[PDB]
Amino acid sequence: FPRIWLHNLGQHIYETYG
Known part of the structure; x- marks a missing residue:
């Protein structure tokens, strides 16, 4: 799960786009 690190x-x- 991408939820991890x-x-x-x-x-x-x-x-980068901020």
Whole structure:
């Protein structure tokens, strides 16, 4: 489940387009 540490990685993308 992406909910694991794979979920915090999605937050990085936001900074790239933030």
